[PDB]
Ligand binder design. Structure first.
Ligand SMILES: NC[C@@H]1O[C@H](O[C@H]2[C@@H](O)[C@H](O[C@@H]3[C@@H](O)[C@H](N)C[C@H](N)[C@H]3O[C@H]3O[C@H](CO)[C@@H](O)[C@H](O)[C@H]3N)O[C@@H]2CO)[C@H](N)[C@@H](O)[C@@H]1O
Ligand SMILES: [Mg+2]
Ligand SMILES: [Mg+2]
Ligand SMILES: [Mg+2]
Ligand SMILES: [Mg+2]
Ligand SMILES: [Mg+2]
Ligand SMILES: [Mg+2]
Ligand SMILES: [Mg+2]
Ligand SMILES: [Mg+2]
Ligand SMILES: [Mg+2]
Ligand SMILES: [Mg+2]
Ligand SMILES: [Mg+2]
Ligand SMILES: [Mg+2]
Ligand SMILES: [Mg+2]
Ligand SMILES: [Mg+2]
Ligand SMILES: [Mg+2]
Ligand SMILES: [Mg+2]
Ligand SMILES: [Mg+2]
Ligand SMILES: [Mg+2]
Ligand SMILES: [Mg+2]
Ligand SMILES: [Mg+2]
Ligand SMILES: [Mg+2]
Ligand SMILES: [Mg+2]
Ligand SMILES: [Mg+2]
Ligand SMILES: [Mg+2]
Ligand SMILES: [Mg+2]
Ligand SMILES: [Mg+2]
Ligand SMILES: [Mg+2]
Ligand SMILES: [Mg+2]
Ligand SMILES: [Mg+2]
Ligand SMILES: [Mg+2]
Ligand SMILES: [Mg+2]
Ligand SMILES: [Mg+2]
Ligand SMILES: [Mg+2]
Ligand SMILES: [Mg+2]
Ligand SMILES: [Mg+2]
Ligand SMILES: [Mg+2]
Ligand SMILES: [Mg+2]
Ligand SMILES: [Mg+2]
Ligand SMILES: [Mg+2]
Ligand SMILES: [Mg+2]
Ligand SMILES: [Mg+2]
Ligand SMILES: [Mg+2]
Ligand SMILES: [Mg+2]
Ligand SMILES: [Mg+2]
Ligand SMILES: [Mg+2]
Ligand SMILES: [Mg+2]
Ligand SMILES: [Mg+2]
Ligand SMILES: [Mg+2]
Ligand SMILES: [Mg+2]
Ligand SMILES: [Mg+2]
Ligand SMILES: [Mg+2]
Ligand SMILES: [Mg+2]
Ligand SMILES: [Mg+2]
Ligand SMILES: [Mg+2]
Ligand SMILES: [Mg+2]
Ligand SMILES: [Mg+2]
Ligand SMILES: [Mg+2]
Ligand SMILES: [Mg+2]
Ligand SMILES: [Mg+2]
Ligand SMILES: [Mg+2]
Ligand SMILES: [Mg+2]
Ligand SMILES: [Mg+2]
Ligand SMILES: [Mg+2]
Ligand SMILES: [Mg+2]
Ligand SMILES: [Mg+2]
Ligand SMILES: [Mg+2]
Ligand SMILES: [Mg+2]
Ligand SMILES: [Mg+2]
Ligand SMILES: [Mg+2]
Ligand SMILES: [Mg+2]
Ligand SMILES: [Mg+2]
Ligand SMILES: [Mg+2]
Ligand SMILES: [Mg+2]
Ligand SMILES: [Mg+2]
Ligand SMILES: [Mg+2]
Ligand SMILES: [Mg+2]
Ligand SMILES: [Mg+2]
Ligand SMILES: [Mg+2]
Ligand SMILES: [Mg+2]
Ligand SMILES: [Mg+2]
Ligand SMILES: [Mg+2]
Ligand SMILES: [Mg+2]
Ligand SMILES: [Mg+2]
Ligand SMILES: [Mg+2]
Ligand SMILES: [Mg+2]
Ligand SMILES: [Mg+2]
Ligand SMILES: [Mg+2]
Ligand SMILES: [Mg+2]
Ligand SMILES: [Mg+2]
Ligand SMILES: [Mg+2]
Ligand SMILES: [Mg+2]
Ligand SMILES: [Mg+2]
Ligand SMILES: [Mg+2]
Ligand SMILES: [Mg+2]
Ligand SMILES: [Mg+2]
Ligand SMILES: [Mg+2]
Ligand SMILES: [Mg+2]
Ligand SMILES: [Mg+2]
Ligand SMILES: [Mg+2]
Ligand SMILES: [Mg+2]
Ligand SMILES: [Mg+2]
Ligand SMILES: [Mg+2]
Ligand SMILES: [Mg+2]
Ligand SMILES: [Mg+2]
Ligand SMILES: [Mg+2]
Ligand SMILES: [Mg+2]
Ligand SMILES: [Mg+2]
Ligand SMILES: [Mg+2]
Ligand SMILES: [Mg+2]
Ligand SMILES: [Mg+2]
Ligand SMILES: [Mg+2]
Ligand SMILES: [Mg+2]
Ligand SMILES: [Mg+2]
Ligand SMILES: [Mg+2]
Ligand SMILES: [Mg+2]
Ligand SMILES: [Mg+2]
Ligand SMILES: [Mg+2]
Ligand SMILES: [Mg+2]
Ligand SMILES: [Mg+2]
Ligand SMILES: [Mg+2]
Ligand SMILES: [Mg+2]
Ligand SMILES: [Mg+2]
Ligand SMILES: [Mg+2]
Ligand SMILES: [Mg+2]
Ligand SMILES: [Mg+2]
Ligand SMILES: [Mg+2]
Ligand SMILES: [Mg+2]
Ligand SMILES: [Mg+2]
Ligand SMILES: [Mg+2]
Ligand SMILES: [Mg+2]
Ligand SMILES: [Mg+2]
Ligand SMILES: [Mg+2]
Ligand SMILES: [Mg+2]
Ligand SMILES: [Mg+2]
Lengths: 272, 49
RNA sequence: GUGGGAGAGGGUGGUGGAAUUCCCGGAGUAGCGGUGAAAUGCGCAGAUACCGGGAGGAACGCCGAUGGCGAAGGCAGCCACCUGGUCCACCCGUGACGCUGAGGCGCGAAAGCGUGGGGAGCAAACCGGAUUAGAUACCCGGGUAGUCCACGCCCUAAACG
RNA sequence: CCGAGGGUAGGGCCCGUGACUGGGGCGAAGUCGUAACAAGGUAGCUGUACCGGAAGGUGCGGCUGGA
RNA sequence: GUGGUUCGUGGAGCCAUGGGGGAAUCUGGGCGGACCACCGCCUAAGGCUAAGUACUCCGGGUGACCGAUAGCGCACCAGUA
RNA sequence: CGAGCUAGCCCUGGCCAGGGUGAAGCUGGGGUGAGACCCAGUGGAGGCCCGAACCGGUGGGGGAUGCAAACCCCUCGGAUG
RNA sequence: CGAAUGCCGGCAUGAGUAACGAUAAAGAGGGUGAGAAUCCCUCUCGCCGUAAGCCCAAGGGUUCCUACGCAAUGGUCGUCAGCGUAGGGUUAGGCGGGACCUAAGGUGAAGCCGAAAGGCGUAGCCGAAGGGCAGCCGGUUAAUAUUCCGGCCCUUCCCGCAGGUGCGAUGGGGGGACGCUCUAGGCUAGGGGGACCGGAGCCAUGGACGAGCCCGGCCAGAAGCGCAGGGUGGGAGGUAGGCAAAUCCGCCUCCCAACAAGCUCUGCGUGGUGGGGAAGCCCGUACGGGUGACAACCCCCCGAAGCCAGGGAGCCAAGAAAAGCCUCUAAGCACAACCUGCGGGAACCCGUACCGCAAACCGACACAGGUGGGCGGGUGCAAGAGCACUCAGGCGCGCGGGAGAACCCUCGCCAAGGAACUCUGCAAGUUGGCCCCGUAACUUCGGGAGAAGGGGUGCUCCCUGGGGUGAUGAGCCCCGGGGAGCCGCAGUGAACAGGCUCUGGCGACUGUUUACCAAAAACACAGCUCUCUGCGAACUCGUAAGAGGAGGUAUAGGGAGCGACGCUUGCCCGGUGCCGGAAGGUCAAGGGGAGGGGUGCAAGCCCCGAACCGAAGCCCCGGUGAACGGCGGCCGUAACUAUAACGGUCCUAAGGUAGCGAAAUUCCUUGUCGGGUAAGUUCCGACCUGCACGAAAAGCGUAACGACCGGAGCGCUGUCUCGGCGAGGGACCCGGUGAAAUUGAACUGGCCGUGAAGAUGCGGCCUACCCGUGGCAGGACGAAAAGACCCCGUGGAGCUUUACUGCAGC
RNA sequence: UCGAUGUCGGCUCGUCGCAUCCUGGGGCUGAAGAAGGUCCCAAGGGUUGGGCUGUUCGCCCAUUAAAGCGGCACGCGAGCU
RNA sequence: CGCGGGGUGGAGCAGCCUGGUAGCUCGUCGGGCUCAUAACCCGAAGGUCGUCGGUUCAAAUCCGGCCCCCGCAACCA
């Protein structure tokens, strides 16, 4: 839906906030299962190695369930859907009859009170997790494992999915959010449905501060700098570059393919 | 204005203390040099309890 | 009211094959395309033509009409749901409740605009090749918006009987 | 107190004027090309859209005021 | 592929050797500056080994060495203020 | 040897008088087939406004072997981010 | 030794010169003393008072208190001192820190890595104004006290007795436990008032013996209560989860509760007892002591940002950990143990003085600078921590005295004129708070807006209306309205408190930057686009391990550019880059040996070595511009001339479209018209011959925004005509302390010559008794800095690339 | 003169040369008068206010008896800007 | 002033560097087609190569000096 504001201030006239109506009466989270201390820090042991990180709201990590094959066969009741500061998506709090409480990343269409479960069994319904094999060709799916028993790694961003395209002996072909065509092992779990919160892309930050709230420090142009700092630094009053556009570290930034050629992963990929 | 000396006992101790110098080869040599020199004070005297 | 009927009438969801285009495999050799005739162009880096496989998008051949439905714009494969109009028989209830309609309000092809999606063919703009005195055209080979969908706008027509 | 009117200040309509600029009317024998009327030598008209010295062309849908 | 040696790729051995290949046990092996013949010299891939030599914190002797702006930075409670 | 100045990030605490304007949203009324929407009233949003502390350093003057190796007077910006 | 702007030292000159560190301010009397403007005391005066006053923390470390001292330290003086000598002074189970816990970070057995030295590194450990934790109020010291003493009150521990219970962990679970903004109720702190209660005294100078003036009317406190509030559901079955176990927690399932009823927990009120208790006056202290007092110790009001606190409500950016604590069991033990009540005994270590917005910390100084947290009284201005004055409290800023010139700083005022000043209204003025009328273009519909422009503002009396708190009334308190009337030049009567418009440029906007000359139109920014990346991601740091990315997964992450928003971003792929091309050309090592040489008597051993096989890169074929970049010359032509829609030709990879255009871009230039002016190299509108705009180094627009830059007008003034007076601080004169750069020596005149070409110093002439003091600044090519430009030096550095040459990387 | 001679314009203060802009004295004039033209003596004193530009200069505005030229380190920054 | 690029029939361009021959396009002229014109067709003429000079057997061509044309530069002060 997206919340919109009137221009009672500049920067309030474009600004735009998510709709939280799917956030069920459960705004503060769940101890026990999560949260952990989350360790803010824009850099490695010592030095900054990703520029322009820092500031922005304190967070608690929700330790979510990315391998659903523990509770094969054990169903769970979806108890709530809550805000997760550390991902684009929303998260489902679910209660297993087992007693155990996990969070699943919350798919589009998930309703509270719903039944959900994981395993070879598993009715093909939104929320359920299955090894890729038993899932019908053509159904859209998410939180897909890359290699079996290694955890969900594909399609967890808000409003993303992959679609099952066909099969090939032990592998089923996937079409990933990027549009790539991937052979992913049959035995990999993946949960049916799309991610949801799909209006995430429609949000307009609206002002500088908002950027900072999310811990995004000001990014400065190479043009703004000096020859010591950047290939684009200097010279006089503005300058068009004077070389093929580059990163600060000298590599070209328009076109230069960067995936290494001899990756053994290659023989499992069929697209862009 | 604000000058450059902003005394802090803890800082002076953690920074220039006998135990800091002892911790690394760089520092151990400092004690060696100061000893051979005949320095009355190997490290700065940080006070208080 | 009671009981019936025809229909491409509207919306949402689902789905079938034919064909074009692209990728992959086989087999295959020196031209294919195109026109008034040509050339740009495609092709020994293996094209065209044929076989098999996959991908995707749009439009539904036959039925089809000089036909049907809608108040218009319009509406065509197939299935279900939701839903408007309407005709017929019976003469069953109401009992003049009737007709039109300034404003208002909704509807409103195509093209166009917004944000997002999609993009197979086609195709303004654009680029080439011919024709011309020139040709910012007709023809030719390319090709972007767009044509497609969700939602929001736009509100015009030889919206013509 | 009211009060003709004078003063300051700001708005409303109207008229005149303005370098310059837009398209328009009319002005016997100036240039350019041929769009339309015969199938007008690409049927024409049309709403919209882009492009073009110019009529104009083209895309999409529509009309018969054409086959 | 390199270092070492007077040796800087040179005709470049010898001695060390990171990488690949990879033997023999005296009729065995290495060397004598590419190489080959001959004639000779040693016996690799285990280790230990005084003395003659270097130094001068420390003690002593001596100076065609200084003598308080010299001589150590310091003759003096100096690596002090 | 230095981040006890300074530049950023991390962890933990603290500070921001007093006024202004009055978004959404509720609530009632109006409207309609249901709407949209329009009214009040309430409500208390905002790198919003005025203005201290506080963070600045705009303009001028003074100071220039200074009170000061950046200072003082008048003036100005921000002040819930 | 004579010069090295030489080194070290001593002593000169400037010079009794400038200065003596905030313009908050002083005077007098008395003491002491060898000696007083400066030390004590008293009176009078002035200054702070959201401090210039008290309380912390940091830092300092003897600076505290006392006796005796004045050579030095003090910008003078000093009998004084933060100075010199000596002596005394800091008392804790309850405050802070440690024998408690964890954060980032550090450290680090296991493990991994590294020529070495070392680098990572989960468990654990360390790490604090964060979590946990039991003291309130008064008294005494010259100097310490939540530390001593008094009263009232707790906390662990250990051994007992008494009663209860399955007790039991570094293990399970629960809790601790968490944002911002706005907030309700009940209180406390603090504050105002009182005819009431308590008090020494007081009638002054015309009046007042009066609900007269003045001072004061509290503090702490266990239990039990009382009020306000915070917390919490209780049963029973089933139980496969919480990494062993569980009666716990979680998940089902039924009944009871839906309430704070009941349980506990806080805060506040009351509380046995305990304590304080003014002005005044008299004392001798430097200071504190008695007296008032047997003090009184009472009602009303305002009232927090503080308490109840884990309160509530809304929002999006989504808001530490661990222990203490409760509980669940496990081994083990159940003569143990643990809980509860009572008794006795045990309770260590360090800090504790004083300064603490400053003369004791940071700035070489007793420095006008810097320095975190708490309290910060009253009255008035709408409010407030603002401003004026003033409590408490603390100062008069460690040279004075006179004078009353220039000149300077700071201030005040001015006739007539009001921008003529000037590079600019630079500066200074005007304006200024509140309430009430009243407001344009434009616009994104918010705004523009405090647009503009206006009026009201005091005090007196009358009538009158809501609340608050009290009972529905009294008062005390907060807001209103109506009506008469008084006074002054003037009513936010002092202080705090916009000058207003119009039109261009640039940038959207709040924001950010050259600490110490630039705050901008530069940076950033939301947003747009391109491009990389499928996850052991790309990218970055490190040789590595490893870490970031990210405990993220294409709606995500990196790099570039552009920079809200609207309308838009044309054409060129020839060159360069980037991408895509199982062909071909070229291509190193290695594979390959046709073939030739060296030895040898030969077997052999040793070299050269052509075919062909050999990758990526290049070459070549394609594509690609929100990738690097680029986007023409000439000649003619219309029935007035002028001009050229039209044509010819050369060349290109293609020859600038739209939209702007003498511009932040225009040389010729003050282009040319037009407007503003009496007058306009600037400004505003246009034409276009664009030296040399132009479409994401974006193009043309844009409301709002700005200590940005330009032009204009109104309002107002010492900016100016054009000055003048007046104030304070200096300047000057006297007493005191008393520097500086500079300095070849000096007995240091003008003109005209001359001289290395600008003479006090040489020539001739001219003038000129010796020495000072306040002033001006022409000269000594004055001082200051081995010129910052320039050039030289085969001098140095930062920077770029299709300079060379390497190297990391791929 | 580079071990430094501050460099444009303005401002304040001046002062000098005259090849004189004004005023005084003249000769010739194609000098009727008035007003000019032009030349010769002569510097004693004078030699305005604004608009635009950093401007010097210049161009305008309104006046004037006139709106003089040039030197003094394009005089003058230990005097200002 | 310095720098280097051009002057070729009526117009716009070749030609030179490797001297010996001036060619393409358009336009002009005659002929055709048409009712006529333009388009088209068939034929045809037109250049002292800016101007002085030598270099040579011979200069558009190579070299100097002027003549106009075009484009560059003119910097630290
Ligand atoms: N009245 C005509 C209107 O204007 C236009 O027409 C205008 C022009 O097109 C037209 O120009 C014509 C030209 O077309 C034609 N081929 C040649 C002619 N000599 C011109 O003529 C013009 O100029 C001449 C002399 O000055 C006059 O005498 C005459 O009246 C005038 N029409 O002159 C007209 C104005 O007078 C539109 N084409 C027409 O549709 C419109 O309705
Ligand atoms: Mg936790
Ligand atoms: Mg470290
Ligand atoms: Mg940027
Ligand atoms: Mg820069
Ligand atoms: Mg570089
Ligand atoms: Mg670079
Ligand atoms: Mg530039
Ligand atoms: Mg550059
Ligand atoms: Mg009937
Ligand atoms: Mg009836
Ligand atoms: Mg009708
Ligand atoms: Mg359409
Ligand atoms: Mg978008
Ligand atoms: Mg096509
Ligand atoms: Mg034709
Ligand atoms: Mg086509
Ligand atoms: Mg429509
Ligand atoms: Mg029809
Ligand atoms: Mg008009
Ligand atoms: Mg006209
Ligand atoms: Mg036509
Ligand atoms: Mg025609
Ligand atoms: Mg036609
Ligand atoms: Mg059309
Ligand atoms: Mg076209
Ligand atoms: Mg060597
Ligand atoms: Mg050998
Ligand atoms: Mg030998
Ligand atoms: Mg030997
Ligand atoms: Mg030995
Ligand atoms: Mg000595
Ligand atoms: Mg001696
Ligand atoms: Mg509302
Ligand atoms: Mg508010
Ligand atoms: Mg604000
Ligand atoms: Mg500044
Ligand atoms: Mg403010
Ligand atoms: Mg000498
Ligand atoms: Mg000397
Ligand atoms: Mg000396
Ligand atoms: Mg003197
Ligand atoms: Mg003097
Ligand atoms: Mg003096
Ligand atoms: Mg003083
Ligand atoms: Mg004495
Ligand atoms: Mg005062
Ligand atoms: Mg002492
Ligand atoms: Mg003392
Ligand atoms: Mg004494
Ligand atoms: Mg003294
Ligand atoms: Mg002093
Ligand atoms: Mg003392
Ligand atoms: Mg102990
Ligand atoms: Mg500890
Ligand atoms: Mg610990
Ligand atoms: Mg840790
Ligand atoms: Mg370590
Ligand atoms: Mg603590
Ligand atoms: Mg404690
Ligand atoms: Mg004390
Ligand atoms: Mg138990
Ligand atoms: Mg526990
Ligand atoms: Mg626990
Ligand atoms: Mg009396
Ligand atoms: Mg009490
Ligand atoms: Mg268990
Ligand atoms: Mg007393
Ligand atoms: Mg709360
Ligand atoms: Mg622990
Ligand atoms: Mg103490
Ligand atoms: Mg104390
Ligand atoms: Mg303080
Ligand atoms: Mg002092
Ligand atoms: Mg001080
Ligand atoms: Mg401060
Ligand atoms: Mg006020
Ligand atoms: Mg207060
Ligand atoms: Mg104040
Ligand atoms: Mg005046
Ligand atoms: Mg006046
Ligand atoms: Mg005036
Ligand atoms: Mg002026
Ligand atoms: Mg002037
Ligand atoms: Mg101005
Ligand atoms: Mg001003
Ligand atoms: Mg302006
Ligand atoms: Mg502006
Ligand atoms: Mg800005
Ligand atoms: Mg700053
Ligand atoms: Mg600066
Ligand atoms: Mg600013
Ligand atoms: Mg690192
Ligand atoms: Mg990693
Ligand atoms: Mg991580
Ligand atoms: Mg990105
Ligand atoms: Mg930019
Ligand atoms: Mg920019
Ligand atoms: Mg821009
Ligand atoms: Mg472009
Ligand atoms: Mg190109
Ligand atoms: Mg290319
Ligand atoms: Mg290409
Ligand atoms: Mg390539
Ligand atoms: Mg190759
Ligand atoms: Mg122009
Ligand atoms: Mg330009
Ligand atoms: Mg003016
Ligand atoms: Mg003008
Ligand atoms: Mg003009
Ligand atoms: Mg530009
Ligand atoms: Mg560009
Ligand atoms: Mg700003
Ligand atoms: Mg004055
Ligand atoms: Mg005075
Ligand atoms: Mg004196
Ligand atoms: Mg003399
Ligand atoms: Mg001379
Ligand atoms: Mg002499
Ligand atoms: Mg002389
Ligand atoms: Mg002088
Ligand atoms: Mg001088
Ligand atoms: Mg000098
Ligand atoms: Mg020099
Ligand atoms: Mg050289
Ligand atoms: Mg010089
Ligand atoms: Mg000198
Ligand atoms: Mg004369
Ligand atoms: Mg005369
Ligand atoms: Mg003069
Ligand atoms: Mg000049
Ligand atoms: Mg000169
Ligand atoms: Mg001068
Ligand atoms: Mg100066
Ligand atoms: Mg220079």
């Amino acid at each position: 839906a997206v919340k919109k504001f009137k221009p009672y201030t500049p920067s309030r006239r474009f600004m735009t906030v998510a709709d939280f109506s799917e956030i069920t009466k459960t705004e503060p989270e769940k101890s026990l299962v999560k949260p952990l201390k989350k360790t803010g820090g824009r850099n490695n042991q010592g030095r900054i190695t990703v520029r322009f990180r820092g500031g922005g709201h304190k967070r608690l990590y929700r330790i979510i369930d990315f391998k659903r094959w523990d509770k094969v066969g054990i169903p769970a009741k979806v108890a709530a859907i809550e805000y997760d500061p550390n991902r684009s998506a929303r998260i489902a709090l679910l209660h297993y009859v087992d007693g155990e409480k996990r969070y699943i990343i919350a798919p589009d269409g998930l309703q509270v009170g719903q039944q959900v479960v994981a395993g070879p069994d598993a009715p093909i319904q939104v929320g359920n997790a299955l090894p890729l094999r038993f899932i019908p060709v053509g159904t859209v799916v998410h939180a897909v494992e890359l290699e079996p028993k290694k955890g969900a790694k594909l399609a967890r961003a808000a409003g993303t999915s992959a679609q099952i395209q066909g099969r090939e002996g032990d592998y089923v072909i996937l079409r990933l959010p990027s549009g790539e065509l991937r052979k992913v092992h049959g035995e990999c779990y993946a949960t049916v449905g799309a991610v949801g919160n799909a209006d995430h892309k429609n949000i307009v930050l609206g002002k500088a501060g908002r950027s900072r709230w999310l811990g995004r420090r000001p990014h400065v142009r190479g043009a703004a700098m000096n020859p010591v700092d950047h290939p684009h630094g200097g010279g006089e009053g503005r300058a068009p570059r004077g070389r093929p556009p580059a990163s600060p570290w000298g590599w070209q930034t328009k076109g230069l393919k960067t995936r290494k050629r001899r990756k053994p992963s290659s023989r499992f990929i069929i697209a862009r | 204005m604000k000058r450059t000396w902003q005394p802090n006992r803890r800082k002076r101790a953690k920074t220039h203390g006998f135990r800091a110098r002892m911790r690394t080869p760089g520092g151990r040599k400092v004690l060696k040099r100061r000893r051979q020199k005949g320095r009355w004070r190997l490290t700065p005297a940080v006070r208080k309890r």
